[PDB]
């Protein structure tokens, strides 16, 4: 009656994990190696298809994490190494007019540096931040060392390599496809009844930050609360805003870049001095916009924790500076901003905010071992305007009051940041070969 008929080109797929390649329109993320993008990339809507999606088991996040770390190492490899800088520093307090906010944050350190000739040395002086300098001994000898000299080698970032994130697209190789959930109220996990296939993901900027998601995607209609297990306080809650909150971060100090020849063709870039006054770096956010955004976040959290539960926001309970502050890179400078005024509110069911920011010039990105980076100073004054598009929050566990929930900023694992952009994308492999009964028999 019925006979096996073989079909090739069947629109069937399986869950898969593969190596997705790159498409992009002197950069950290290479960009030359990454394939050029194609205009008007095709998007095809799959009608009558419901596909399960898990953001919390998406291998695109792990691949992006590995790729960004590897690209960072590759960018750092050919740049000037600053191993000679591990010498005794003689540091005094800056003698210019310094605001109380900054009195003791910046030190003027003198040291004996090498030159292009191995038999000569030079006496030089550089300005260093207090979060990059360690007292050599407890006694008041005024002799100090760089923070990394005991644990890690330090490499200077190439001044010609910009730290501005640029959008990148992750593309499937032939035989694989990227499925995009188009549901606008998608909680991250579960069936998606509105699916499309794409050649590549949208433009994702690999912005590195903690506690606030910057320059990301916005929720289409409502604030989205996504968590792998909302009952598990060990997992982070990703909040995606439906409206951005504008944050204006500045390093007010006018800055100079002093070039010191430390080898035959190696230059070290020191801060040198500040023209004009010395003022603390800081970020401004609108008070009303932030307050309405927090009201919306609370409204969405009550859908998981109860209509009558008190929602409290408080500052980070602990961790390193990268996770107790809002850390980010803008303008080439690394800011560590105190968000204690962003999360300082109790919400019962019934102007601008200025965040002080500290600067470091010695950065250990991620948590690698034995490798640090010196960030060269940027000349001039840095002014930065960014969109806050989401939060990474942790719920306080072990509560002794069941009528109140407390949420604190978290971060430090960038897979939670890049999972906030890749949450809607899934990689599948195509199974074009299939069999089915028909009435056709081979002669």
């Amino acid at each position, epitope marked *: 009656n019925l006979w096996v008929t073989v079909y090739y080109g069947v629109p069937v797929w399986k869950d898969a994990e593969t190596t997705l390649f790159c498409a992009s329109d002197h950069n950290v993320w290479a960009t030359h190696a990454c394939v050029p993008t194609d205009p008007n990339p095709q998007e095809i809507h799959l009608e009558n298809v419901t596909e399960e999606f898990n953001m919390w088991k998406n291998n695109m996040v792990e691949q992006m994490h590995t790729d960004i770390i590897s690209l960072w190492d590759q960018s750092l490899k050919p740049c000037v190494k600053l191993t000679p800088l591990c010498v005794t520093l003689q540091c005094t307090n800056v003698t210019n007019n310094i605001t109380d906010d900054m009195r003791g944050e910046l030190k003027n350190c003198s040291f004996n540096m090498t030159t292009e000739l191995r038999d000569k040395r030079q006496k030089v002086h550089a300005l260093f931040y207090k979060l990059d300098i360690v007292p050599i001994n407890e006694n008041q000898n005024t002799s100090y060392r760089l923070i990394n000299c005991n644990t890690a080698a330090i490499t200077q970032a190439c001044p010609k390599v910009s730290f501005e994130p640029i959008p990148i697209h992750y593309c499937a190789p032939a035989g694989f496809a990227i499925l995009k959930c188009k549901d606008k109220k998608f909680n991250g996990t579960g069936p998606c009844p509105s699916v499309s296939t794409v050649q590549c993901t949208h433009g994702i900027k690999p912005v590195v930050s903690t506690q606030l998601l910057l320059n990301g995607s916005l929720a289409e209609e409502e604030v989205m609360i996504r968590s792998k297990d909302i009952r*598990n*306080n060990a997992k982070n809650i990703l909040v995606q805003f439906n409206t951005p909150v504008q944050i204006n971060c500045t390093r007010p100090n006018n800055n100079t870049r002093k070039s010191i020849r430390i080898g035959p063709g190696q230059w070290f870039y020191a801060t040198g001095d500040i023209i004009g006054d010395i003022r603390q770096a800081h970020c401004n956010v609108s008070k009303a916009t932030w307050n309405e955004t927090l009201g919306k976040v609370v409204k969405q959290l009550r859908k998981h924790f109860g209509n009558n539960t008190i929602i409290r926001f408080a500052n980070s309970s602990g961790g390193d500076l990268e996770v107790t502050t809002h850390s980010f890179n803008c303008g080439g400078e690394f800011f560590y901003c105190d968000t204690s005024g962003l999360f300082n509110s109790t919400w019962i069911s019934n102007d601008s905010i200025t965040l002080p920011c500290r600067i470091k010039q010695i950065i250990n990105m991620w948590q690698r071992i034995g490798q640090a980076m010196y960030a060269p100073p940027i000349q001039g004054v840095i002014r930065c305007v960014s969109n806050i598009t989401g939060l990474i929050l942790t719920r306080d566990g072990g509560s*002794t009051d069941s009528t109140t929930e407390t949420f604190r900023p978290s971060g430090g694992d960038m897979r939670d940041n890049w999972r906030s952009e890749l949450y809607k994308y899934k990689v599948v492999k195509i199974e074009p070969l299939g069999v089915a009964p028909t009435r056709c028999k081979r002669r």
Partner: antibody
């Protein structure tokens, strides 16, 4: 072999600080959350908090929030818990425990020996 | 918040059943309920994880289930090495503790 080795027992006066270490071995340190749980003699188990040894982020119970600090060092693979301003009832056996994976499961596969801290005048 | 009997008792050869009762509602939060066994003097060990799973190397005697708010362990085949403290856990909450006395 996965092992957790804690510091030895300590005697403290009220108002002092106590810092208990936990050296881990046999697994990738950054791949599992570290939890601190205390048990007073003759009573049940009380969870104190967790630290993410990768991101360094922490989470403290409300009973200890404001007094307890948790830190980690990935170079020497050691987790630390510090209680300030001890009181008389704070005497307990403080255990460090390794989560089976990266913060998803709370059934602790491995435990330390337990550091007995006694607080008295 | 996870009440437990103060003590339980059995005879060698028969079976015992410990119960853990949760004040909170069901709200599908009881999927991850683990059990611990604390031989006096040592650090707890895990007998059940996620209501009715067993760590590799744990004897089949220990076996728990769940019913709504309540969730129980069954030590079937009680020996003399069962004089421990048995604690139910849901994430961070620990049970109050049951001392299983062998007779």
């Amino acid at each position: 072999q996965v092992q957790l080795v804690q510091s030895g027992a300590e005697v403290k006066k009220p108002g002092a600080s106590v810092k208990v270490s936990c050296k881990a071995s046999g697994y990738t340190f950054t791949g599992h959350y570290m939890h601190w749980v205390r048990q007073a003699p003759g009573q049940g188990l009380e969870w104190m908090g967790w630290i993410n040894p990768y991101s360094s982020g922490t989470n403290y119970a409300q009973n200890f929030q404001g007094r307890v600090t948790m830190t980690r060092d990935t170079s020497i693979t050691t987790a630390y818990m510090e209680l300030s301003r001890l009181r008389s009832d704070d005497t307990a056996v403080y255990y460090c425990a390794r989560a089976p994976d990266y913060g998803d499961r709370w059934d602790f596969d491995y435990w330390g020996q337990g550091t007995l801290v006694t607080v008295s005048s | 918040a996870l009440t437990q009997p103060p003590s339980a008792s059995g005879s060698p050869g028969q079976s015992v059943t410990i119960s853990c009762t949760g004040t909170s509602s069901d709200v599908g939060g009881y999927n991850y309920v683990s059990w611990y066994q604390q031989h006096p003097g040592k650090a707890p060990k895990v007998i059940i994880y996620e209501v009715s799973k067993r760590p590799s190397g744990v004897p089949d005697r220990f076996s728990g289930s769940k019913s709504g708010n309540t969730a129980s362990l069954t030590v079937s085949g009680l020996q003399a090495d069962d004089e421990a403290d048995y604690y139910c856990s849901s994430y961070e909450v620990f049970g109050t503790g049951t001392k299983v006395t062998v007779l």
